Design an enzyme around this catalytic site. Structure first.
Site, short mmCIF file in Angstrom:
data_model
loop_
_atom_site.label_atom_id
_atom_site.label_comp_id
_atom_site.label_asym_id
_atom_site.label_seq_id
_atom_site.Cartn_x
_atom_site.Cartn_y
_atom_site.Cartn_z
N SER A 51 -57.46 21.39 -22.72
CA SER A 51 -57.51 22.31 -21.57
C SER A 51 -58.18 21.75 -20.33
O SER A 51 -57.70 21.98 -19.22
CB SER A 51 -58.16 23.64 -21.93
OG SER A 51 -57.32 24.34 -22.82
N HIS A 69 -63.60 24.49 -17.76
CA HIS A 69 -62.29 24.45 -17.07
C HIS A 69 -62.45 24.14 -15.59
O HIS A 69 -61.68 23.38 -15.03
CB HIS A 69 -61.54 25.76 -17.26
CG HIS A 69 -61.11 26.00 -18.67
ND1 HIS A 69 -60.77 27.24 -19.15
CD2 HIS A 69 -60.96 25.14 -19.71
CE1 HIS A 69 -60.44 27.14 -20.43
NE2 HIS A 69 -60.54 25.88 -20.79
C1 LIG Z 1 -56.96 25.65 -22.53
O1 LIG Z 1 -57.29 26.10 -21.46
C2 LIG Z 1 -56.17 26.45 -23.49
C3 LIG Z 1 -55.21 27.20 -22.67
N1 LIG Z 1 -54.38 26.23 -22.01
C4 LIG Z 1 -54.01 26.61 -20.66
O2 LIG Z 1 -54.62 27.53 -20.07
O3 LIG Z 1 -53.33 25.66 -19.93
C5 LIG Z 1 -53.34 25.70 -18.56
C6 LIG Z 1 -52.14 25.89 -17.84
C7 LIG Z 1 -52.15 25.91 -16.45
C8 LIG Z 1 -53.33 25.76 -15.73
C9 LIG Z 1 -54.53 25.57 -16.43
C10 LIG Z 1 -54.53 25.53 -17.83
C11 LIG Z 1 -54.36 28.08 -23.54
C12 LIG Z 1 -54.62 29.45 -23.67
C13 LIG Z 1 -53.84 30.27 -24.48
C14 LIG Z 1 -52.76 29.75 -25.17
C15 LIG Z 1 -52.48 28.40 -25.05
C16 LIG Z 1 -53.27 27.57 -24.25
#
Ligand SMILES: *C(=O)C[C@@H](NC(=O)Oc1ccccc1)c1ccccc1
Ligand SMILES: CCCCCCCCCO[C@@H]1O[C@H](CO)[C@@H](O)[C@H](O)[C@H]1O
Ligand SMILES: [Cl-]
Ligand SMILES: [Cl-]
Length: 178
Positions: free
Chosen positions: A110, A161
């Protein structure tokens, strides 16, 4: 097609995620997680390998989707070295912030994704001549994920993040100077 860094990262994440299915999350976390005791502080892969672990299907699927698209674009237009550095630094800084605020038990791409979208977005926003940019639909798709995680609508922390995003903005900023 997805370059070698884009490709090898996807594979590594898959292999690690298989290992976690076969052995359970905890046991794999025992080997790859951020050092969770001073006994482990000199096991140096751990400052990075935490990024390779994912805990649900959706976690790895959405992370890898964004990685493949953004990371793959960066690798193709700006090269493998660029992608490597963004990844290494974002992984280290988001890992750092995460453990500082909530301990060493965490995982996933992430932080790296936040860096890539911060990078692609700012780069294009400041220098279209580069050829890289986050198109409008994706800026919208991206924001919806930022919002989600922010208010804990998916289950996944904010500070890490932000830390990831800072890395991408910083590098795009630098890259778009003369
Ligand atoms: C990590 O943040 C897990 C999260 N991934 C996600 O938010 O990816 C992104 C996409 C676009 C911008 C920033 C981050 C996640 C949450 C829930 C389900 C899968 C992945
Ligand atoms: C007219 C508005 O244009 C949009 O402004 C956004 C910022 O507000 C940019 O991020 C986006 O890419 C751009 O198309
Ligand atoms: Cl669009
Ligand atoms: Cl560049």
């Amino acid at each position: 097609r997805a370059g070698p860094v884009t490709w090898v990262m996807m594979i590594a994440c898959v292999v690690v995620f298989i290992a976690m299915q076969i052995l359970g999350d905890q046991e794999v976390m025992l080997w790859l997680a951020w050092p969770f005791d001073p006994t482990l502080k000199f096991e140096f892969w751990r400052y990075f390998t935490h990024a390779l672990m994912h805990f649900s299907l959706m976690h790895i699927l959405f992370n890898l989707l964004w990685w493949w698209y953004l990371g793959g674009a960066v690798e193709k237009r700006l090269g493998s070295g660029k992608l490597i550095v963004i990844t290494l630094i974002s992984a280290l800084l988001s890992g750092y912030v995460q453990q500082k605020f909530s301990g060493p038990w965490f995982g996933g791409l992430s932080g790296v994704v936040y860096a890539l979208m911060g990078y692609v977005w700012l780069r294009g926003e400041r220098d279209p001549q580069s050829g890289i940019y986050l198109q409008r639909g994706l800026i919208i798709f991206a924001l919806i994920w930022i919002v989600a995680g922010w208010f804990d609508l998916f289950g996944m922390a904010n500070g890490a993040h932000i830390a990831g995003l800072a890395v991408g903005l910083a590098m795009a900023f630098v890259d778009s100077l003369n």
